[PDB]
Design a protein around this ligand. Structure first.
Ligand code: FBU
Ligand code: HG
Ligand code: ZN
Length: 258
């Protein structure tokens, strides 16, 4: 059936329709700090978001995304473990019903309140569709959110959620600066993985930042007020839209710092 996060169509059922679910490079995984390999040959991250053009915010029934104009090298990511330029196409969050759960990746088994995913695709492939067929087609920057003080740069997103309550609704969302969601440090962990939602394709290089950002209870509280359902259907609150950590198998998590 159309996949979801419920008892009957959740992550433990995805394998029936998406065999790749039991593959060798599935995400997310648990980050074991004592086992991660510090690699000094890794380069520093290069994030150029000064010419970014946000366009729209939409509730797709699984989460809400903020889409950006990716027809040109306007907001890119390079460096780190990547080769080539990757264009930002959208960012979304994964969160929980309670502050002690919500993130997809865990560090030493610890779950954060939420996780931000800035999705980028390798420009050498032409368009997003082609990149999802290549082993190095996508690069997602993952940022953990912990409950604390308000994040000013996130406030514009919070204000507009009201108009995109149910599945299928969208609102114009121009002039948003994604630079306001980055932590101070760009130190990160990296490993080969996959999308965390169906089709679960193994086309991703994961870059998870070491330093989380702080957002207030009221800020995260407004995420929980979104709906999985569409207008007119019975109401299911949008919470716990996250996949459990998958076995590492034979992969190595590397780190840019020591
Ligand atoms: N969750 S995720 O970041 O791996 C992801 C990225 C994407 F571009 C599309 C998806 F459906 C899911
Ligand atoms: Hg792929
Ligand atoms: Zn995601």
């Amino acid at each position: 059936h159309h996949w979801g996060y419920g008892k009957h169509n959740g992550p433990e059922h995805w394998h029936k329709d998406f065999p790749i679910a039991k593959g060798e490079r599935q995400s997310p995984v648990d980050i074991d700090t004592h086992t991660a390999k510090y690699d000094p040959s890794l380069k520093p991250l290069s994030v150029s978001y000064d010419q970014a053009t946000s366009l729209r915010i939409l509730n797709n029934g699984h989460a809400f995304n903020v889409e950006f104009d990716d027809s040109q090298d306007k907001a890119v990511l390079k460096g780190g473990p990547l080769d080539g330029t990757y264009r930002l196409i959208q960012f979304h969050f994964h969160w929980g019903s309670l502050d002690g759960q919500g993130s997809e990746h865990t560090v030493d088994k610890k779950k954060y309140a939420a996780e931000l995913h800035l999705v980028h695709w390798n420009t050498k492939y032409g368009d997003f569709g082609k990149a999802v067929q290549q082993p190095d087609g996508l690069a997602v920057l993952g940022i953990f959110l912990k409950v604390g003080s308000a994040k000013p740069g996130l406030q514009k997103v919070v204000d507009v959620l009201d108009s995109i309550k149910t599945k299928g609704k969208s609102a114009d969302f121009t002039n948003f600066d994604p630079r306001g969601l980055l932590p101070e440090s760009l130190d990160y962990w990296t490993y080969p993985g996959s999308l965390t939602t169906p089709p679960l394709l193994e086309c991703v290089t994961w870059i998870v930042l070491k330093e989380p950002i702080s957002v207030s209870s009221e800020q995260v509280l407004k995420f929980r007020k979104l709906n999985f359902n569409g207008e007119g259907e019975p109401e299911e609150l949008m919470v716990d839209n996250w996949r459990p950590a998958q076995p590492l198998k034979n992969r190595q998590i590397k780190a840019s710092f020591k």
